[PDB]
Amino acid sequence: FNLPPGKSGWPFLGETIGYLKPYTATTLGDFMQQHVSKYGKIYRSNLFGEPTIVSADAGLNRFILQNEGRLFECSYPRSIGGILGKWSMLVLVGDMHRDMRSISLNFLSHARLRTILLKDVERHTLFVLDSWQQNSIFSAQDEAKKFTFNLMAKHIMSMDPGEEETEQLKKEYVTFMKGVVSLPGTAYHKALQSRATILKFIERKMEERKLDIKERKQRTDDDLLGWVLKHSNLSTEQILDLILSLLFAGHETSSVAIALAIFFLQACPKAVEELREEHLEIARAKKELGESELNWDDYKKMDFTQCVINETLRLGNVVRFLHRKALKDVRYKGYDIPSGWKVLPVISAVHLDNSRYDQPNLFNPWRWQQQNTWGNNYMPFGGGPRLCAGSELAKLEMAVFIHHLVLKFNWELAEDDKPFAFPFVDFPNGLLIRVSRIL
Numbered sequence: 001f002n003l004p005p006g007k008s009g010w011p012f013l014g015e016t017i018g019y020l021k022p023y024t025a026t027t028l029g030d031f032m033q034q035h036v037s038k039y040g041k042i043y044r045s046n047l048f049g050e051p052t053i054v055s056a057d058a059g060l061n062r063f064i065l066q067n068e069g070r071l072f073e074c075s076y077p078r079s080i081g082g083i084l085g086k087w088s089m090l091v092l093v094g095d096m097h098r099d100m101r102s103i104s105l106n107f108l109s110h111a112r113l114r115t116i117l118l119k120d121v122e123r124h125t126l127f128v129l130d131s132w133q134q135n136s137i138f139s140a141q142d143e144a145k146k147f148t149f150n151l152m153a154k155h156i157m158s159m160d161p162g163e164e165e166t167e168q169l170k171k172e173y174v175t176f177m178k179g180v181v182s183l184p185g186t187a188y189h190k191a192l193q194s195r196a197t198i199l200k201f202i203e204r205k206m207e208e209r210k211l212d213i214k215e216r217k218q219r220t221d222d223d224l225l226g227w228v229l230k231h232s233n234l235s236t237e238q239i240l241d242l243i244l245s246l247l248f249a250g251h252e253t254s255s256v257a258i259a260l261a262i263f264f265l266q267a268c269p270k271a272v273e274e275l276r277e278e279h280l281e282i283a284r285a286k287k288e289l290g291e292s293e294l295n296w297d298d299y300k301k302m303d304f305t306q307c308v309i310n311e312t313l314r315l316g317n318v319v320r321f322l323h324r325k326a327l328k329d330v331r332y333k334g335y336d337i338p339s340g341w342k343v344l345p346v347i348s349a350v351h352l353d354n355s356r357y358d359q360p361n362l363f364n365p366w367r368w369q370q371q372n373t374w375g376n377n378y379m380p381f382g383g384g385p386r387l388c389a390g391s392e393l394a395k396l397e398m399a400v401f402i403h404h405l406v407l408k409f410n411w412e413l414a415e416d417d418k419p420f421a422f423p424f425v426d427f428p429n430g431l432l433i434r435v436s437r438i439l
């Protein structure tokens, strides 16, 4: 019987404060690097109020991910467990989760991806990028968040950008997100108030949709709200939790990824040159054909863009680790994971590994003309039965945004900045950039 080595830290809190200490997002951070150096890639700790096995071992992390529902299961801390609702897909397990995942996969199907969703992705890209003024200075992080929130609101509830009900859902949504990152104080009871308001807003739009469906109007299931009403048997409270958890799942991730790409690309002008060549050829082809909107076949031509995307996610690491629990005693590589203990697969660790990538701290999208996303080396979307249901939409959002960005603008940092993990990734100075339109 061999328990992994490590400390236990302070009572109640353990090593949580040190574990959560902000660190530059392109690294693992002092706490993680030092613990791996002293104890190895598998070590024990006391985190988020529970005894914990931390894993920076890519072989163990894929074993955990693939054995969801058998040896391990998703398990958030008590505080974080319930802010997205009892029926949040990110927290559910068992049959209910299997049913909610099947719904998300079907709504995000390839057929719907290449017709419905792509049109909205390009429309929302141009809604943002056409408002950018010459020689202006602004926060790219805020613009990225604008793009992805607008886009998600369209996808889930057919809301249009810039309209009042959408700008007000943003303020309510961010006030609610100030609860996840937290006495409770007046900034936690405020987040529960906002959550209730949001749930009442979603239930309002749900009743309007049930009327559209009863009156047999066409294309009622273009958004997620209409889709679950027509194609599922979820209850009202289940629908509200699904809508809210999808907004979070799709916006918090995609916004960071877009911002990371803007950041990495201004420091890699040769990658922007190759992107312009690839995207100018696509645009020239459509001009000769007299076609205006992008189609799936144009997206399939964005080979080097997919290299930038993979490199952005490998180096930037939108998600630092996952929250899991062991369902029974497990033995792996000679260590014992006791039942009921928390298990944290640090899926970001292998992305920064010297032995799996050559110069992992360098942004080098050309490495993906040799490497591949299959296997242990690459898991920014997770793995196993909970592998990210929106990954294909995420890549499409980045590709379409990049396409119009490099065709319309040059950009530079107006103020020094760097990404940090809190563990959520964010730019402290807001990623201010100056832009100028091309010829």
Ligand code: HEM
Residues within 6 Å of the ligand: 074, 089, 090, 101, 104, 246, 249, 250, 251, 253, 254, 257, 313, 318, 319, 322, 323, 380, 381, 382, 383, 385, 386, 387, 388, 389, 390, 391, 393, 394
């Ligand atoms: C760069 C963008 C994204 C990244 C890095 C990312 C990452 C992840 C990861 C690591 C998980 C696994 C959670 C776990 O195993 O506990 C996950 C789950 C999920 N993601 Fe994403 N995601 C991204 C974009 C999106 C988008 C755009 C959507 C939807 C519009 C989405 C929807 C979901 C859903 C529904 C799940 C739950 C899957 C399940 O429980 O079976 N994601 N994501």
Ligand SMILES: [Cl-]
Residues within 6 Å of the ligand: 356, 357, 358, 367, 371
């Ligand atoms: Cl490499």
